[PDB]
């Protein structure tokens, strides 16, 4: 019920600025969050910041006095920019959309990939094995260590295919979202946090990573593959 795409160039030189757009479609809204989320090669995911519904916004601390988060309402737009852009600034760029009235719905855009030639605390969100192979029908168990405490209603899962963006997979530790199979199910709490397939299928094989938005930044686990034997 909201479609959100990116856009901007693919390529940039060093020192220079990154501008992207993010086009807003589908039904009006009366509160929310755009965010900024880029993914890292190798798939470590990253959270830029946000502008509000009322225009307020909160850049990650990591990237503050380089980045700007506007908004064209009239166009429906909301933009990124990054100012003294490097080779660690290659990446593929989301914008989503969030409204915490509702925590249980979260929209991502297709993803754009960009390629270039402060003063904060952050939990750490560690996610082993990195990788992992299992078979058909064996009941999976996935974990996520917090290195610091973490509110259960703000630890969340997410699944992500190849060529595709993360999809919200659970919330608030252990609800499922729309769209997820009965067979998946989350616990924990605390520092402490695991997600469960009682039998795995053929297509179960993916990413997945859990993410806690408990404190600023919010944070990404850097995911465990899970691969079919
Ligand atoms: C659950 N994923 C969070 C990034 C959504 C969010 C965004 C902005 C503000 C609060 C919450």
């Known amino acids: 019920e909201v479609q959100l795409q990116e856009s901007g160039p693919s390529l940039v030189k060093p020192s220079q600025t990154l501008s992207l757009t993010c086009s807003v479609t589908g039904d009006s809204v009366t509160s929310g969050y755009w965010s900024w989320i880029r993914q890292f090669p190798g798939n470590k995911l990253d959270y830029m910041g946000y502008?509000?519904?009322?225009?307020?916004?909160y850049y990650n601390p990591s990237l503050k006095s380089r980045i700007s988060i506007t908004r064209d309402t009239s166009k429906n737009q909301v933009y990124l920019q990054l100012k003294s852009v490097s080779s660690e600034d290659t990446a593929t760029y989301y914008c989503t959309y969030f409204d915490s009235d509702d925590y249980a719905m979260e929209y991502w855009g297709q993803g754009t990939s960009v390629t270039v030639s402060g003063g904060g605390s952050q939990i750490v969100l560690t996610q082993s094995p990195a990788i992992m192979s299992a078979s058909p029908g064996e009941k999976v168990t996935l974990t996520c260590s917090a290195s610091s405490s973490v509110s259960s209603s703000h630890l969340y899962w997410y699944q992500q295919k190849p060529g595709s963006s993360p999809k919200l997979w659970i919330y608030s530790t252990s609800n499922l979202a729309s769209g997820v199979p009965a067979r998946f199910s989350g616990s924990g709490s605390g520092t402490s946090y695991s997600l469960t397939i009682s039998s795995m299928e053929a297509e179960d094989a993916a990413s997945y990573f859990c993410?806690?938005?408990?404190?600023?930044?919010?944070?990404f686990g850097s995911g465990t593959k899970l691969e079919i034997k």
């Open positions: 993410h806690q938005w408990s404190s600023f930044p919010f944070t």
């Open positions: 502008i509000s519904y009322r225009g307020s916004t």
